[PDB]
Structure 1
Amino acid sequence: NPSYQQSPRHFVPTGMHSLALGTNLVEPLHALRLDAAGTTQHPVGCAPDEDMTVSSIASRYGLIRRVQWKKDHAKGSLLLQLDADPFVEQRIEGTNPISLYWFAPVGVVSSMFMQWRGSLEYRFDIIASQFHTGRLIVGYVPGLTASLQLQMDYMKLKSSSYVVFDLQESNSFTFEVPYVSYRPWWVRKYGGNYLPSSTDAPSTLFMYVQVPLIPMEAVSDTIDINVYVRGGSSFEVCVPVQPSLGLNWNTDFILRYRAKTGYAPYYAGVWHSFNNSNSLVFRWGSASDQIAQWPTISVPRGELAFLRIKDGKQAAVGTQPWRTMVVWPSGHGYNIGIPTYNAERARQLAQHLYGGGSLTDEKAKQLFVPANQQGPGKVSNGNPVWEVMRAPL
């Protein structure tokens, strides 16, 4: 047993590893396995077939648009205008207060990333017979603002890049979209509910009618056109951010009087600092000074306020549901909630206090609920809403 007498190491401690890095490190863990060298396997028919790859997701066509192209559409009538980005929407006509949207897979996989660049591919499938004859431009104008979305025809379109397609016997084509910008990447269309981060398209795609439809008298006069989107061979995305899209699994949103957050559920119990434990006050726990805290109601001179719970079934319960209360400073730096037997008592206690009285006055004490009404001391159902009852004083 020799003695090690050299100088030791001299570190810096931190409490957590790389919460963001994920590629070229070896993250140590407490693996809840039995073998330390054991990993997961895939034998032999339950092997992966689809690699998790953004260039494999964006290379898949998604139907985004249907367009009716009719016989009475004149020479140069607009069929569609849309944005040269993966963020192309198809709104569902639902009755929900928040509307759902269909996206291409390139748009879903580009919602997670901040910046995109590359070519897009719009597949136009024109459902027609071999007896329909027509001709249309799929054009592409480099960067347009919102005021230049109008003042658009088929003639200003032919100044920029455009493709004229004839429909005789082949009823499908694919327009590959150029990527023209002042910037190598392009910041995405929507933010993570940060409305001062909105950005429109790099450029705008149009589809006018160069030659109108001539159908024969034995076929229909209307033709459906499907528009499919996938990110082309040069499409790529880089920087991961919060995705601007959400699932529809829980399609429930909550728009922003009750206890301050955390101070619920509460029950009516006693406290040595409120009338020497002789009267009920709302508590959020059984331990030292676990007293529920309540917001200050805005009350002008000449008025009072007290509280009446909106749904009595949600109230704390003693010998009765505690459906009415007065909120008042405790003297300890926060407001306490003082239940009463009924609204009449609450109104009389609020009258006393907003009238200039004190919680230590005999008139106030006689309006409290006595400690022997605590009963089971059941807690409220969560943090329920109370109506603020206002009156002139």
Structure 2
Amino acid sequence: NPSYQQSPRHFVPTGMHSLALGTNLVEPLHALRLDAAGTTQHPVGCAPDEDMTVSSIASRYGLIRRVQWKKDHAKGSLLLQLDADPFVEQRIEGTNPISLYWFAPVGVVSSMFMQWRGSLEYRFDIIASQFHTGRLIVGYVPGLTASLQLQMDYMKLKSSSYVVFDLQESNSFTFEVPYVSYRPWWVRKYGGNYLPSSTDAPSTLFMYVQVPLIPMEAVSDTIDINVYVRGGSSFEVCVPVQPSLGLNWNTDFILRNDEEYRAKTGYAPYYAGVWHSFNNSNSLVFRWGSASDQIAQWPTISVPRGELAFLRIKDGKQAAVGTQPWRTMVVWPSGHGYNIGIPTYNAERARQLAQHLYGGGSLTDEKAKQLFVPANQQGPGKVSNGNPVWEVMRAPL
């Protein structure tokens, strides 16, 4: 046992391994695997078919658009003018307040990144019989602001880069959208729910009917056209940020309107209870907990002077239940720097109590304490269901 007299190392502790990192980096863990060096293995029949990869996804067409193209369309007539960005849209007729949208896979994968660059591709499928014949420009104007988004025609479009096409025999092709910007990359069109920092597309596609369709009488005047977005071979993204999109799996949302009233966060579920500082626990008061001084705290109601208010729950089912469900309540300051909620038998006792407290009367006053609900009423002491909304029963005083 020689003494190790030499000086000790001198680090700096930290509580956690890095999160954002995810590459050339061994990442220590407490494996629940039994073997010290074991690892998941893929049976040759279970082999990973797919090499997940940005390009691997980006190189996949998705239908994005369905132009109708009637015979009667003028040679000048536009068909569409979708933007030259991955984030092309396809709204669904979701009756939901949050309408859903189809996206080309490239747009979706793009949504996870702040920046992107490179060419795109639009396969066009002119679902048409060979006998149909027509011709149409699919031009590309760099640098259009929305004010200039209009004023367009196929002809101004011709001033910039464009491609004419002749529908006759082959009934489909693939335009390839150029990447042209002052910026080496390009900022995401949208972003996390945060409207500023949502720059629009660098440039815009167009497609006009350069020569009106000339169908035979024996075939239909209308012709369906379909548009397939796909990442170009040049296409690429870089910086990873919050995706600007959500799955349709749970299209549910909750507005934070302030109009409804309810207990402060972390103070629910609450139950009618007792508290020695309050009437010596001789009267009920909501508690978010059992240990002493776990009184539910409540937001301060803004009562204009000369009035009063008292809470009344919008749902008796969610009410904490003593001997009775407590659908009515009066919030008043604890005197300890927060607002306790005091259960009442009814909107009326709560009213009278408000007549008292907003009448400037104290909780200590008999008028209040008579309105206070006695500890015996606590009964089961059932908690409130979650943090139920309380209607604010304002009344003039």
What is the TM-score normalised by the length of structure 1?
A: 0.99
Report how far residue 373 of structure 1 moved: 1.1
Contact 2:120 2:230 in 1 (8 A): yes
Name whichever structure is richer in strand by fraction.
1
CA distance in 2, matches of 1:164, 1:340: 78
Partner secondary structure for residue 313 of structure 1: coil
Report how far residue 191 of structure 1 moved: 1.2
CA offset digits 1:281-327 (Å, max 9, x no partner): 11111112111101111112110111111111111111111111111
Report how far residue 188 of structure 1 moved: 1.0
Deviates more, 1:336-345 or 1:201-210: 336-345
Partner secondary structure for residue 213 of structure 2: strand
CA distance in 1, matches of 2:206, 2:395: 62
Report how far residue 233 of structure 1 moved: 0.8
Partner secondary structure for residue 352 of structure 1: helix
Report how far residue 225 of structure 1 moved: 0.6
CA distance in 1, matches of 2:184, 2:250: 37
Contact 2:275 2:292 in 1 (8 A): no
CA distance in 1, matches of 2:125, 2:333: 71
Report how far residue 5 of structure 1 moved: 0.9
Q: How does 1:312-323 map to 2 (within 5 A)?
A: 312-323=316-327
CA distance in 2, matches of 1:49, 1:363: 77
CA offset digits 1:102-125 (Å, max 9, x no partner): 000100110001111111011011
The runs of at least 4 consecutive aligned structure 1 residues that moved more than 4 Å come to: none
**2:290 matched to which residue of 1?**
286
Deviates more, 1:340-349 or 1:12-21: 340-349
Contact 2:134 2:211 in 1 (8 A): yes
CA distance in 2, matches of 1:370, 1:190: 56
CA distance in 2, matches of 1:130, 1:345: 83
Partner secondary structure for residue 162 of structure 1: coil
CA distance in 2, matches of 1:342, 1:151: 66
Partner secondary structure for residue 82 of structure 2: strand
CA distance in 1, matches of 2:396, 2:327: 22
Report how far residue 205 of structure 1 moved: 0.6
CA distance in 1, matches of 2:141, 2:334: 68
CA distance in 2, matches of 1:343, 1:232: 67
Say whether residues 1:329 and 2:333 are aligned partners.
Answer: yes
Partner secondary structure for residue 293 of structure 2: coil
Partner secondary structure for residue 112 of structure 1: coil
CA distance in 2, matches of 1:75, 1:277: 85
CA offset digits 1:352-383 (Å, max 9, x no partner): 11112111112211111111111111111111
Deviates more, 1:317-326 or 1:239-248: 317-326
Partner secondary structure for residue 45 of structure 1: helix
CA offset digits 1:258-279 (Å, max 9, x no partner): 1111111111111110111211
Report how far residue 50 of structure 1 moved: 0.9
Partner secondary structure for residue 346 of structure 1: helix
CA distance in 1, matches of 2:347, 2:120: 67
CA distance in 2, matches of 1:11, 1:213: 77
**1:243 matched to which residue of 2?**
243
CA distance in 2, matches of 1:117, 1:234: 8
Report how far residue 198 of structure 1 moved: 1.7
CA offset digits 1:231-275 (Å, max 9, x no partner): 111101000000001100011010111111111111111111011
**Structure 1 residue runs without a partner (length 5+):** none
**2:357 matched to which residue of 1?**
353
CA distance in 1, matches of 2:5, 2:285: 65
RMSD: 0.8
Report how far residue 2 of structure 1 moved: 1.1
CA distance in 1, matches of 2:138, 2:346: 73
CA distance in 1, matches of 2:364, 2:22: 62
Aligned length: 393
CA distance in 1, matches of 2:268, 2:2: 62
What is the percent sequence identity of the aligned residues? 100
CA distance in 2, matches of 1:2, 1:387: 76
**Structure 2 residue runs without a partner (length 5+):** none
Which of 258, 275, 278 does residue 274 from structure 1 map onto?
278
Partner secondary structure for residue 88 of structure 1: coil
